[PDB]
RNA sequence: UUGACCUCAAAUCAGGUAGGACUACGCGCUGAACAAUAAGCGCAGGAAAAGAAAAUAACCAUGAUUCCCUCAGUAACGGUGAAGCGGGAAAAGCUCAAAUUUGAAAUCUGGCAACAUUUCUUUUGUUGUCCGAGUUGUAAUUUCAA
RNA sequence: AUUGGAUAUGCCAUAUAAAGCGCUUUCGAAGAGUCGAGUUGUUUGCAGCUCUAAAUGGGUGGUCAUCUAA
RNA sequence: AGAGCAUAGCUGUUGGGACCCGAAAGAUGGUGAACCAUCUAGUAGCUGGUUC
RNA sequence: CAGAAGAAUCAUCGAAUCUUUGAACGCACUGCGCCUUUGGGACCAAAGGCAUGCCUGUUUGAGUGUCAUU
């Protein structure tokens, strides 16, 4: 085993922003929240916003 | 606001200024005192054995061999030319004094 | 002979921490000294403008700062650079003048013997 | 005043004055030990311009090395090893003959309070300068290893710097 | 692994520990008391210089400065200072004036020796031909020049 | 002669300092296989070395050194194999020799005396005096940027 | 408790002194068995040997530019 | 009336200790012809093996 | 187990102690000494030191010195 193995992997930024804009978009869909295991069957509204 | 703004350009308008003299460029000038010091020591230390033989060749007037000997001993003509001019300056001065 | 860059996030934070202690030691003054504007010495980049090492002696005298004090108020000196174009003298004298506009100088107490 | 005149009298090393001195001095130096103390430098102006000052803690040792590694660089390694406590400042050619080269090596006493309190020669008391004749940090050491600015003057090749993201 | 590391691991002596690791904590400010008082202990020096009205670097930033919020013929001329954009800069500037105010008496008095020195010259060679009074040597013992004699004349006034 | 000055020695004459160890990093000398390579030898530090151009360049010219990125597997060599440029990190500059202080060796170690001083009764200084060092040159001064 | 760089303030200052900028009808020293040459080893420099210099000179680059070694 | 550039994968190829194991070495430096330690992952077209 | 009840097979730690050896230091490598001081109850014992090179200085003497010197 050699320490100069490839540990860190490059992703273009515009790939990272797309994967995270998509990740933010899918947090507003209640189905993809239950289907991930989140117990939000009584949450008043999605996306859930509070005041400052 | 002190700020460096790099890139693009800053200006195409050019005005050359006649640059001064730097004193490090002044190196190699013949100081009036040190010429006397070098001359006096040249008189005192005498002459090199090879350089003494150059004087006789000049006195005997085989200048062609004198150049050959100095060039062989020193290494290049300009080094040999200066020595010959240095030597012949001695010879004429000794002959007028003595 | 192989080098690894695992300390790359370690070295960057060490540099930031090294900047913060410098700022602590010298509070009012900036962590960086001012540098002049010069042009790269090649046909490829000659139209560019970047930073230099320090301000030449014509850049200090024209701006109105002696060469000895300049080292003390943070203006660095380059005895090797010279001004061949006036636009190079102009871009760096005004660079000094704008710096002395924003430069607060703290007075220092001075020995005052009773006699003279 | 004088070291101007001594500068140009030492520039002519085969003139009669010097050659007559080269024979006289070499004969008496070979009569001595190989490494021996010298009260006053055999070349006062050269020792002066190389750093030597006529004050306590400044020492000079003359050494002959067989002709036929640099000879002057040798003189420094042999003198320093002889005077284990002194730090070697410099070295200069004094004389030579058909079978030997005579070198004088200037040393400094790192403990003498005339030196330790001298603002200009203090740098030699610092342990980083222990035996500069042994590491190659003297003038001839700097030359003999080709150190300097120019175009005429290893592991950076073999290494394989693999950045974190490659 | 090593012998020296391993014998003291087996032994009974306690390890020479040092609880020195304080990650993420910045260097506390000493020096100018004004900026220390207005120095946020959490913000970075680029943030604190900016918040305090000071330039951390007069030279170009080599990177991308933070965007926290969506932000919407002359060699003789002199730049007439820069007004302070913050109170704290004015606090630093005000102290500069007061420190200079205390150190205002830059004129020096005279000691007895140079006092009578200047009277002996003045009452003999008037008060205007300073070059001539520097030319005399019988009274000008130290052989001062005209420039320094005038300085003594001005300094003796007050 | 005296006695100076020079050398020559010795002393359990006072004050010192060197050695061996470590060796990852570092500076040298040196070295065969299979390559400034292992080894061998020598010398150090918390870094070592390097360092304020006898440096580039042919430009609107740059400007101590060191490391990083690129220049580039490029030029060149004949596969070996760089350097300016550029972009970053960091930045700080300096001291001598060569000048007659010559209207005044103004310089300095050591002994002794008190005064102090402390990571410290364990440190490090000053003042005074005496003796030496030094005029074959110790201070100030000046280092080419002048 | 032990120290560090600053501030505040008391006392002491040998200043007859010491600096920067300025103007010059006066000046301006510059590192030799070194550079350099032939030649021989080592790996271009370095090393030995043979000789061995100069003063707008000397090194290096392109009659010019830059630099100022020992 | 330009189609690349960058990342990830797959297979291929060239190096690198290079699928694993196995040929007298040689050299450096030591110990009392012998022996030891390292350079060394020295050398292979070959041998034997290479896993649901 | 013992063991005391400022305990502790404790911590901290700035004071002393730190066997013979080893760069290893009197010569030797077990012995043999030397010198000085301390003393014993002239001699002996103990203690102290007694290794080389080099540097600054002090004293002593000598050189075939150079003089100096009526």
Curated annotation (Swiss-Prot), chain A:
It is found in: Cytoplasm. Component of the ribosome, a large ribonucleoprotein complex responsible for the synthesis of proteins in the cell. The small ribosomal subunit (SSU) binds messenger RNAs (mRNAs) and translates the encoded message by selecting cognate aminoacyl-transfer RNA (tRNA) molecules. The large subunit (LSU) contains the ribosomal catalytic site termed the peptidyl transferase center (PTC), which catalyzes the formation of peptide bonds, thereby polymerizing the amino acids delivered by tRNAs into a polypeptide chain. There are 2 genes for uL4 in S.pombe. Component of the large ribosomal subunit (LSU). Mature yeast ribosomes consist of a small (40S) and a large (60S) subunit. The 40S small subunit contains 1 molecule of ribosomal RNA (18S rRNA) and at least 33 different proteins. The large 60S subunit contains 3 rRNA molecules (25S, 5.8S and 5S rRNA) and at least 46 different proteins. uL4 is associated with the polypeptide exit tunnel. uL4 interacts with its chaperone ACL4 and the nuclear import receptor KAP104. The eukaryote-specific C-terminal extension harbors a nuclear import signal and delivers the ACL4-uL4/RPL4 complex to the pre-ribosome, triggering uL4 release from ACL4 and incorporation into the 60S ribosomal subunit.
From Swiss-Prot, chain B:
The keyword Zinc-finger does not apply. It is found in: Cytoplasm. Residues 1-31 are annotated as: Disordered. One of its GO terms (cellular component) is preribosome. Pfam families: Ribosomal_L36e. The keyword Ribosomal protein applies. PROSITE patterns: RIBOSOMAL_L36E (PS01190). InterPro entries: Ribosomal_eL36, Ribosomal_eL36_sf. Gene3D superfamilies: 60S ribosomal protein L36 (1.10.10.1760). GO terms for biological process: cytoplasmic translation. GO terms for molecular function: structural constituent of ribosome. Keywords: Cytoplasm, Ribonucleoprotein, Ribosomal protein. Component of the ribosome, a large ribonucleoprotein complex responsible for the synthesis of proteins in the cell. The small ribosomal subunit (SSU) binds messenger RNAs (mRNAs) and translates the encoded message by selecting cognate aminoacyl-transfer RNA (tRNA) molecules. The large subunit (LSU) contains the ribosomal catalytic site termed the peptidyl transferase center (PTC), which catalyzes the formation of peptide bonds, thereby polymerizing the amino acids delivered by tRNAs into a polypeptide chain. There are 2 genes for eL36 in S.pombe. Component of the large ribosomal subunit (LSU). Mature yeast ribosomes consist of a small (40S) and a large (60S) subunit. The 40S small subunit contains 1 molecule of ribosomal RNA (18S rRNA) and at least 33 different proteins. The large 60S subunit contains 3 rRNA molecules (25S, 5.8S and 5S rRNA) and at least 46 different proteins. Belongs to the eukaryotic ribosomal protein eL36 family. This is Large ribosomal subunit protein eL36B. The gene is rpl3602.
UniProtKB/Swiss-Prot annotation, chain C:
One of its GO terms (molecular function) is structural constituent of ribosome. Disulfide bonds: none annotated. Belongs to the eukaryotic ribosomal protein eL13 family. The chain holds residues 21 to 136 of 208 of the full protein. Its main location: cytoplasm. Keywords: Cytoplasm, Phosphoprotein, Ribonucleoprotein, Ribosomal protein. This is Large ribosomal subunit protein eL13. One of its GO terms (cellular component) is cytosol. The keyword Cytoplasm applies.
Swiss-Prot record, chain E:
Residues 1-23 are annotated as: Disordered. GO terms for biological process: assembly of large subunit precursor of preribosome; ribosomal large subunit biogenesis; rRNA processing. Disulfide bonds: none annotated. One of its GO terms (cellular component) is preribosome. Its main location: nucleus. It comes from the Eukaryota. InterPro entries: Ribosome_biogenesis_Nop16. It holds the Pfam family Nop16. Keywords: Nucleus, Ribonucleoprotein, Ribosome biogenesis, rRNA processing. It is found in: Nucleus, Nucleolus. Involved in the biogenesis of the 60S ribosomal subunit. Belongs to the NOP16 family. Component of the pre-66S ribosomal particle. This is Nucleolar protein 16. It comes from Schizosaccharomyces pombe (strain 972 / ATCC 24843). The gene is nop16.
């Amino acid at each position: 085993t050699k320490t100069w193995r490839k540990w860190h992997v490059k992703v273009n930024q515009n790939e990272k922003r797309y994967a995270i804009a998509s990740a933010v978009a899918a947090s507003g869909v209640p189905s993809l929240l239950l289907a991930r295991g989140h117990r939000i069957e009584e949450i008043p509204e999605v996306p859930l916003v509070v005041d400052d | 606001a002190p700020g460096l703004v790099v890139g693009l350009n800053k200006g195409k308008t050019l005005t050359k200024r006649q640059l001064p003299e730097r004193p490090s460029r002044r190196k190699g000038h013949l100081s009036k005192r040190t010429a006397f010091v070098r001359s006096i020591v040249r008189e005192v230390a005498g002459f090199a054995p090879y350089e003494r033989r150059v004087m006789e060749l000049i006195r005997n007037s085989q200048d062609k061999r004198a150049r050959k000997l100095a060039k062989k001993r020193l290494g290049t003509l300009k080094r040999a030319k200066g020595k010959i001019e240095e030597l012949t300056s001695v010879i004429q001065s000794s002959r007028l004094a003595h | 002979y192989v080098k690894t860059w695992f300390n790359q996030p370690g070295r960057k934070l060490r540099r930031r921490q090294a900047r913060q202690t410098k700022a602590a030691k010298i509070a009012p003054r900036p962590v960086e000294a001012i540098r002049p504007a010069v042009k790269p010495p090649t046909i490829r980049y000659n139209m560019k403008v970047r930073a230099g090492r320090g301000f030449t002696l014509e850049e200090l005298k024209a701006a109105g700062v002696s060469r000895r004090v300049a080292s003390t108020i943070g203006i660095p000196v380059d005895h090797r650079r010279r001004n061949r174009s006036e636009e190079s003298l102009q871009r760096n004298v005004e660079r000094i003048k704008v710096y002395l506009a924003h430069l607060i100088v703290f007075p220092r107490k001075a020995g005052q013997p009773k006699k003279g | 005043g004088a070291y101007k005149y001594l500068e140009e009298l030492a520039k002519k090393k085969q003139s009669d004055v010097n050659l007559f001195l080269s024979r006289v001095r070499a004969w008496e130096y070979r009569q001595m030990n190989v490494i021996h103390r010298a009260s006053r430098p055999s070349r006062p102006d050269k020792a002066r311009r190389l750093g030597y000052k006529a004050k306590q803690g400044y020492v000079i040792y003359r050494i002959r090395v067989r002709r036929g590694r640099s000879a002057r660089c040798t003189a420094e390694e042999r003198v320093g090893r002889y005077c284990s406590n002194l730090r070697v400042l410099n070295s200069y050619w004094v004389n030579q003959d058909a079978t030997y080269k005579f070198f004088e090596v200037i040393l400094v006493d790192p403990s003498h309070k005339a030196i330790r309190r001298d603002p200009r020669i203090n740098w030699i008391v610092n342990p980083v300068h222990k035996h500069r004749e042994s590491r190659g940090l003297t003038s001839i050491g700097k030359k003999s290893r080709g150190i300097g600015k120019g175009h005429r003057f290893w592991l950076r090749h073999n290494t394989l710097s693999l950045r974190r993201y490659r | 692994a090593n012998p020296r590391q391993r014998n003291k691991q087996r032994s009974g002596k306690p390890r020479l520990t040092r609880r020195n690791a304080n990650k993420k904590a910045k260097a506390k400010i000493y020096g100018n008391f004004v900026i220390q008082q207005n120095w946020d202990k959490h913000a970075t020096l680029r943030q604190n210089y900016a918040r305090l009205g000071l330039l951390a670097t007069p030279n170009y930033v080599t990177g991308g400065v933070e965007k926290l919020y969506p932000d919407p013929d002359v060699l003789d001329k002199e730049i007439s200072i820069a007004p302070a954009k913050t109170e704290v800069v004015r606090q630093l500037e005000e102290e500069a004036v007061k420190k200079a105010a205390r150190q205002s008496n830059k004129m020096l008095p005279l000691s007895a020796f140079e006092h009578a020195y200047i009277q002996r010259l003045i009452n003999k060679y008037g008060t205007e031909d300073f070059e001539s009074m520097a030319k005399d040597v019988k009274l000008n013992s130290k052989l001062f020049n005209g420039s320094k004699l005038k300085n003594l004349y001005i300094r003796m006034k007050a």
